[PDB]
Amino acid sequence: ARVKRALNAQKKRRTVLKASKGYRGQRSRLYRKAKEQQLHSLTYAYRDRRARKGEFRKLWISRINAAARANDITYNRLIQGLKAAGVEVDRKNLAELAVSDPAAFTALVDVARAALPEDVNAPS
Amino acid sequence: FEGGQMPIHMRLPKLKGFKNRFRTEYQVVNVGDINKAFPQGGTVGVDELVAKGLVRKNSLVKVLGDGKLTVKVDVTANKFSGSAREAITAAGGSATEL
Amino acid sequence: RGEVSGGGKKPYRQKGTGRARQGSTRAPQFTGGGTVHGPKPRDYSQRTPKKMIAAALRGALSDRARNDRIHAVTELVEGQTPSTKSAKTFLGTLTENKKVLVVIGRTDEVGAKSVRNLPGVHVISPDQLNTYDVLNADDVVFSVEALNAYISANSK
Amino acid sequence: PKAKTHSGASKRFRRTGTGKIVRQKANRRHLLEHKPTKRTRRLDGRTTVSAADNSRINKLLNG
RNA sequence: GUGUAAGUGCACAAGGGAGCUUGACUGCGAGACGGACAUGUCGAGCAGGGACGAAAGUCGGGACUAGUGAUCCGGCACCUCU
RNA sequence: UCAACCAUAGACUCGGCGAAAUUGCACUACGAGUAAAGAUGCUCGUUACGCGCGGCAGGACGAAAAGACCCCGGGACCUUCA
RNA sequence: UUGUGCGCCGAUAAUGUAGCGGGGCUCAAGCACACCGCCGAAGCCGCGGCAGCCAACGUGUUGGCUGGGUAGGGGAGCGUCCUGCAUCCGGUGAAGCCGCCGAGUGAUCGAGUGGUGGAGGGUGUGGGAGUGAGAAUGCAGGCAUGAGUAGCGAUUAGGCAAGUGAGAACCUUGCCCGCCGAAAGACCAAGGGUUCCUGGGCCAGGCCAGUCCGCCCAGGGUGAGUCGGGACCUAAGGCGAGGCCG
RNA sequence: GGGGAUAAGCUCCGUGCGUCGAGAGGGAAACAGCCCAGAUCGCCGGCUAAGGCCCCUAAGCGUGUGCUAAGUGGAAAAGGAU
RNA sequence: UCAAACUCCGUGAUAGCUGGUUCUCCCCGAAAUGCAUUUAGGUGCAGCGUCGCAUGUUUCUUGCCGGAGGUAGAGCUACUGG
RNA sequence: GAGCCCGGUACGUGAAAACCCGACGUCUGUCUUGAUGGUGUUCCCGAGUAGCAGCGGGCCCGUGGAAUCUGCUGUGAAUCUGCCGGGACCACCCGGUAAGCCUGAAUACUUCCCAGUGACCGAUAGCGGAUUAGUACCGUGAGGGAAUGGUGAAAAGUACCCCGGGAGGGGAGUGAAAGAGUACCUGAAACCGUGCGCUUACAAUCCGUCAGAGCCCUCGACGUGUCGUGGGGUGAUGGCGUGCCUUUUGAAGAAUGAGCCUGCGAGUCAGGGACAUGUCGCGAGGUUAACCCGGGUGGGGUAGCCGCAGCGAAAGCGAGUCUGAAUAGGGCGUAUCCACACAAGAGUGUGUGGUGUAGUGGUGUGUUCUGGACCCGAAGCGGAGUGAUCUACCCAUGGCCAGGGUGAAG
RNA sequence: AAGUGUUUAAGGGCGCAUGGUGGAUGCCUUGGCACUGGGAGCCGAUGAAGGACGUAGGAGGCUGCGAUAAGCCUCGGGGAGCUGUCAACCGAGCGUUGAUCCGAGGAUGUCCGAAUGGGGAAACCCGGCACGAGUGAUGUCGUGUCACCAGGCGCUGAAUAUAUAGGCGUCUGGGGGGAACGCGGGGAAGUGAAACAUCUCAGUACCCGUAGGAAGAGAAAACAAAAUGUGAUUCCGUGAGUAGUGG
């Protein structure tokens, strides 16, 4: 039985070419170049899914730092005071409060300042 | 091949001796087989052993004395060992040879 | 690569060309060249032991007999003249299944001709009985002489 | 085509009752003056083939 | 100083001397060392027949470690093989 | 020295026909670094509106010839007291 | 003076600051010693899914550990074709192809759908493979890039008027001008083979165009006692009756 | 440790030494072999390692006690130096 | 086309050499060492992987105990050499 | 997509002539001028032969102790109490009768003809050749050697009109379909356009990925635009980011290869082969080979092969055997386990009972042997032929060398 | 006055919609491949195999045929259309009084080719003899026949005497082609041995001579081993990868 290769190959070629819509130049037209770019794209996506959590945490920390310095307190002392006070709001919702409900953020800053020690540089 | 080193099949001496093209070989059967295969005894020739599947069909037969023989049996083979003869005669049987 | 026509001469310059080095025009990578590992004539028969074959036939026939798919008849039609209508009616009386196996003697020419044209009927001689034909049939209709011949051949 | 066994291996190796492959030891053809009798005694007879050479010798003998 | 390189030993001598002698044996060999394999190395003890010694005992070459060449092929002697 | 001018054939413009070597890509800068040392593509900086046309040859270790230098293996031919 | 903590000259190459990564910093953002926070990874924890090994109880649940990986070893599968058997779909539209909407842990799937199409397919369970390509300076076909770019084949040179024609730098006619003229003129041999003439044509060819042509089509055309050959003769050389040699 | 001129990003050995090879992630500006740490998948949760917290750039122009004037920090010797 | 023309055939010559070798997932997971080699870019055996079988902690780590060294250090009318 | 429409099929039938097989004859040869079993002796029984020697060939046999057979060269016998052979050779036995000739069947093969078949190919496949095929074309020659299949059920192959010189097209018709128009089934990709949406001319980009404004489209819900468990297209802007393969200690590359697409292109087959491991049958047995008979895949076929006893060079002995002077130790063997004793603590052994031992034939898979053996790739080596129309030299027979100088012998 | 602020596309990118090119895919087939069962196993000087040139009412190719030229005669079959095909377009005609078509046997059969009257660059040149035709005669035409060698038979018998060599005449053969298979001779190298010479490859490739439908071999100067044994040859399976043999 002589077997022609067309159907089996066309299947995966169509899959790869469809996945490469929107690419520039050869990378969206030719199957080989599109396949190379697909390897790179999936590697990039895998790496970026891991890095995205850190990126968003960095953005939240930036916003919380801005809103805390607006209340005359630094981010690190505010985090220490919030941990001491036992409140368990994470940085995502802390930034959400900072942007959407400034009064709530000010109240949390007040409780964090209350929970802080009297001399932060003491050998405690 | 061994990499250019003198191989194992060449650095050892050939096994001693010759083959003796005229060698006579016997198909062997022990008296224990006779006991297990002839519970009633009787005459036991070559082709009874062939029929019982104790020896090959067209070969010289020699009887040996491995087992225990407790049945009166008359055996006709080509050769006997000493212990085979004593075992067959001890049970009252005869051991005639071709 | 060696049976295809021509291609005995090395084609062109190995060097200077800037092209790939080719030793023949009939190399497998060439269009029109030979086949690398292609079909060659061969025999597929296997040396199956006799006991295995006979036991398989017995198992198939016993499976048929467990579900009473075995029938015996004296003769398929009234003798000396083939008649497909009579044989078809008789087979309909015997069974309503689709595929039947008819086992008649080699001298029963009238019955064989009578059941020859029926689409679901396969006619076999008693000494040619085999596992494939038995297992392919919903019913096995035996001739009395054929049945006795099979029993005589085996049970003896 | 039936396999052809090796002639030299057939001449140099033997099989015992339980299938053990048995060979003869070397250094016992000539130059036996300076060799003490204990050395020639330890070189006498046959030993079983070492485990490293068992596969190769079995291959050379069977085919 | 130990025949001979160097090393490890040896004065209890393994170094020096004398008397007898041929174990510079035959059949073996528990157990081991070293090792890819092939090689190589040590070995108590048993039997035969001996040397030396009153005897106990020691002797299967040399204080030890180099002085050597597998297989094939052929020569010589003996064998209750063919 | 030490070059200048003139004319034709190209080069240049218009109409017609219409190739080639080459080609992983591509909206293909520079400096100082770094790196398989030899960076348009990595780092830090500097510079730079998009697209063309005519030119020059510093780079793309430009193209070409599975080097034209050394080694390894295989050949071939030649020499002779192999 | 003695030991010490920091410092200074020594100090110094060739594209451009160039021996803090940059801006900048002694109002340290430098160093030493203590202290307090926070940032920071695919590490650990939290929540959910999967798998391998083992354990417990069961007649498949739970639990504990483990799950980077080249050469390589083992295990389980996707898709293609041909086939035994059994079933199902199809001109009320199979395959193939192009979409949409979805699906699976992967190869992949869609008896889900729309368009195109026009005759064969699917499923289960077995059997057999010319069974899967991205690369061998791989092979065949088609087509890009360079690029509407190079070149358009000598050293003589063309012009104008009229004509024909759908169309004229190139075809026809005329008048000029120029070039060869021991040739670029005339005639044979070899070679070619109808290219010769008449009429017709203008897709291919002609390095542009073409109404023209050594191009395409049809028909026609070659006349020997003396010309060149044979029927006459031999050279070198070839073949060689018998023959000699092998 | 040897060879070399204890020169080499030289060469040869030893190492229940490591890593890369065959190892992603974080740090060292970039940086196979250095430091932290071994990626089964998902999360817009948390805690930390190395390394960091003026701006680039996430987090301290943090606190206390001292030193430095050399931009030392942010490369180098013999030696010189109120 | 010539340090032995060309064509076909032996023939699918032979290359320890170069290049290539096509779907998926799950589990495990190296070596670049030793010996020998007309041997050094090859190969044979061993070392290290995997699968199956058999055997059970025999492997490993830590504590304690019993052992042999001739390195670092040191020393030298304790020897040999400078 | 037809058993009942057509050609056919099962089944019957048919030869003037030619040829081929038989048969019966004419015809020919031949025996009968014949036959038997008996008795004692001379002659004959294949000559340049057998044998021998020298040098070779070929036999499992590579000159070997080398028989049998055979070529050339020398020498060279006997006729039956003769000769040859039985693996140097001799004696004895046994077998046969060299140097004369014919001989069918069983066996090998297919240019060609007829009838069939395929878990063979289906137009880059299958023959090189489905089409002008050994053709075109290439070469002086021997020789090498292609590419090119499909409208439709029927040509019904588009009358007529219009633009155009035509080509081509638009109407109109034919057709079930002209998204079937003799550039014709289906009509993929690379490649080349046109139209619409978003974006892009201060910007250093392995061209993606993660966040993401704005714009456009779409599905739901409520009003008039405004969210949602939404979905798609494009994306200003920010973060991260050194192409694939091969070879490598190590390459994003400045080591290798690739312009692109579509087709094609590399662990296969044979053998009762070898080893291992699944699975099936039978089991101390298992199994047939050639072959014979069945229109098959079925039945028969015991010759063999492998297990069933080992040890030893062998004679041989045998649960033992070999070495050896040795019961004196060792080597190999007696499936394995268990119990009981007697010995030893030099490692455990020796016995008595039980227990009872597993092979073999198909077939799957992985390695392996011999075969081109996973595929591709030399320079070269042999055999047989083709070439001196180029060029080297030679042979025969012709031709050509403007013009002007100089001035030897005689 | 200071500040904020859309809007450009010469061209390019991406997506979508529509085309072109190209000829993949799917489905096929007057083609091949591998076999099975039969038949026939030779053709040729009575001119072969294979060709050149011609030949139909019209140009060419394939097919058929040969100056009697898609054909002639006889015997059979068959039965209504036919004048082979590419491949039609005409133009002419045949057929129930049997066409076209199929089978068997005959006739014709240019030229080349073993090629054979002589020559020759295959397919084209020039003849002798005999018998006919034609011409006033020469010219010309038609039909037979004319190679060489071998072996029979007959005649003759050189140098030369016997004689023979040779010569003359007449009969019968041969020559060449063909795919495989057969027999007898000659006989490589690449390769393997990890080099290489003995050896292997391999008595292979190739070459020479010869057949036949098959061939070769074949009727014991055989084996065998004490069996009161087999009984020409050939082929198949085992024996057996064994006994052996081998740098």
UniProtKB/Swiss-Prot annotation, chain A:
Pfam families: Ribosomal_L20 (PF00453). GO terms for molecular function: rRNA binding; structural constituent of ribosome. One of its GO terms (cellular component) is ribosome. GO terms for biological process: ribosomal large subunit assembly; translation. InterPro entries: Ribosomal_bL20 (IPR005813), RIBOSOMAL_L20_CS (IPR049946), Ribosomal_protein_bL20_C (IPR035566). The keyword Ribonucleoprotein applies. CDD domains: Ribosomal_L20 (cd07026). SUPFAM superfamilies: Ribosomal protein L20 (SSF74731). It comes from the Bacteria. Keywords: Ribonucleoprotein, Ribosomal protein, RNA-binding, rRNA-binding. Belongs to the bacterial ribosomal protein bL20 family. Binds directly to 23S ribosomal RNA and is necessary for the in vitro assembly process of the 50S ribosomal subunit. It is not involved in the protein synthesizing functions of that subunit. This is Large ribosomal subunit protein bL20.
From Swiss-Prot, chain C:
Residues 1-46 are annotated as: Disordered. Transmembrane segments: none annotated. It comes from the Bacteria. GO terms for molecular function: rRNA binding; structural constituent of ribosome. The keyword Ribonucleoprotein applies. Keywords: Ribonucleoprotein, Ribosomal protein, RNA-binding, rRNA-binding. One of its GO terms (cellular component) is ribonucleoprotein complex. GO terms for biological process: translation. Belongs to the universal ribosomal protein uL4 family. Part of the 50S ribosomal subunit. One of the primary rRNA binding proteins, this protein initially binds near the 5'-end of the 23S rRNA. It is important during the early stages of 50S assembly. It makes multiple contacts with different domains of the 23S rRNA in the assembled 50S subunit and ribosome. This is Large ribosomal subunit protein uL4. It comes from Mycolicibacterium smegmatis (strain ATCC 700084 / mc(2)155) (Mycobacterium smegmatis). The chain holds residues 55 to 210 of 215 of the full protein.
UniProtKB/Swiss-Prot annotation, chain D:
It comes from Mycolicibacterium smegmatis (strain ATCC 700084 / mc(2)155) (Mycobacterium smegmatis). Keywords: Ribonucleoprotein, Ribosomal protein. Belongs to the bacterial ribosomal protein bL35 family. GO terms for molecular function: structural constituent of ribosome. The gene is rpmI. The keyword Ribonucleoprotein applies. InterPro entries: Ribosomal_bL35, Ribosomal_bL35-like, Ribosomal_bL35_CS, Ribosomal_bL35_sf. One of its GO terms (biological process) is translation. One of its GO terms (cellular component) is cytosolic large ribosomal subunit. Residues 1-41 have a biased composition (Basic residues). SUPFAM superfamilies: L35p-like. Residues 1-63 are annotated as: Disordered. Residues 47-57 have a biased composition (Polar residues). This is Large ribosomal subunit protein bL35.
